[PDB]
């Protein structure tokens, strides 16, 4: 009925000029991308893709950041021939931000819609500069944002797993998902890294020139002040990953919004203990 899409897409153009100086109209990007179905869902009409990708975005109060992300990523993702979906997990409240817990919700909330097998976990302010940077999963956990402009286009350290990453459904289940006890900024990426390695997995990366990324310049946040417990928590991941994770994840779904370009799930994830 429909053939299997090739390993490599014909549509890829390589390097892309990324700008944040111009205004973006979500209504227009919608008409720019007519093939994107309500809720931010796209699947090729030309082929069947092995990459069923749920794209999770931890979110609170960065709508202007979310505009640019959708503006650049939808076209990239479509040229990558992915059977994907866009999930913006929005944290309701004014309490301390928990990136890793919102990611856990996104995994669990996307599965309700569809049989995803890959999961891209992406910050909202990270845009790829090369569409050869595959936004899908591999045999090993995939670090997608490996050459960030804020880091002089180098990996800050080789055990860094922050920014954008890709985990197959089985890779995510092997490590009991992500931690839910990291409140505030930093650490969760280091802990998640520790989970994968302790389960025998290793980090897979595109080469530097491909995994390039621009970040939307912004002032730091009061609801995400640096976590002072993180360095103490990273050192005990092996002992805590069994207790804290997908098995110990609770939340209250307040709202579910099916926008033309994205699915926004507003969630109460609680407060630090």
């Amino acid at each position: 009925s429909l053939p299997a899409c090739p390993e490599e897409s014909p549509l890829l153009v390589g390097p892309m000029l990324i700008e944040f100086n111009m205004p973006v109209d979500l209504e227009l990007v919608a008409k720019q991308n007519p093939n994107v179905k309500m809720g931010g869902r796209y699947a090729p009409r030309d082929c069947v893709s092995p990459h069923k990708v749920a794209i999770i975005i931890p979110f609170r109060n960065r709508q202007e950041h979310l505009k640019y992300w959708l503006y650049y990523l939808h076209p990239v993702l479509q040229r990558q021939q992915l059977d994907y979906g866009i999930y913006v997990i929005n944290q309701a409240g004014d309490t301390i931000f928990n990136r890793a817990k919102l990611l856990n919700v996104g995994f669990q909330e996307a599965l309700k819609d569809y049989d995803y097998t890959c999961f891209v976990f992406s910050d909202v302010d990270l845009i790829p500069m090369n569409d050869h940077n595959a936004y899908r999963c591999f045999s090993q956990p995939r670090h997608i944002s490996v050459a960030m402009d804020k880091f002089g286009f180098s990996l800050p350290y080789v055990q860094y797993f922050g920014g954008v990453s890709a985990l197959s459904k089985q890779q995510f289940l092997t490590i009991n998902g992500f931690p839910n006890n990291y409140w505030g900024w930093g650490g969760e990426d280091d802990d998640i890294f520790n989970r994968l390695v302790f389960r025998g997995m290793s980090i897979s990366r595109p080469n530097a020139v491909v995994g390039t990324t621009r970040m939307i310049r912004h002032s730091r946040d009061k609801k995400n002040e640096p976590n002072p417990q993180r360095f103490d928590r990273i050192a005990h991941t092996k002992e805590t990953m069994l207790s804290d994770g997908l098995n110990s994840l609770t939340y209250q779904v307040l709202d579910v919004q099916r926008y033309p370009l994205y699915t926004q799930i507003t969630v109460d994830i609680g407060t630090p203990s």
Binding site: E19, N21, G152, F153, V209
Partner: protein, 122 residues
């Protein structure tokens, strides 16, 4: 407002090809990741700012109100690196190349020493 293209910019820095062990394609790779060929790109920091296509810091290369004690090596005001004319931007970048070197731009060693074919302009 002026934004070059890869090959358009390439022909403009032709005198720079072979300028001190520097290949033009490596330099093109550099500016793409540095400013995306945008003559009006600007990065604002707390103490300093980087201006234009070459992202030239007011710390010591040019002159601004933010850093009045700048050495001002290129002997020029910093927001002259925002006109559509990079004729003076090139003159200062040439001084950077001559003094600091091509690794003033962090992106060269990291990204622009191999896979240069994409940045070739024939």
């Amino acid at each position: 407002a002026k934004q070059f293209t890869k090959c358009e910019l390439s022909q403009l820095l032709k005198d720079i090809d072979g300028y001190g062990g520097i290949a033009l394609p490596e330099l093109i790779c550099t500016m793409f990741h540095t400013s995306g060929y945008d003559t009006q790109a600007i990065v604002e920091n707390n103490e300093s700012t980087e201006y234009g296509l070459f992202q030239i810091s007011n710390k010591l290369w040019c002159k601004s109100s933010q850093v009045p004690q700048s050495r001002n090596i290129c002997d020029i005001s910093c927001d002259k690196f925002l006109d559509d004319d990079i004729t003076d931007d090139i003159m200062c970048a040439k001084k950077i190349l001559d003094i600091k070197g091509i690794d003033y731009w962090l992106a060269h060693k990291a990204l622009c020493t191999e896979k240069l074919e994409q940045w070739l302009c024939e």
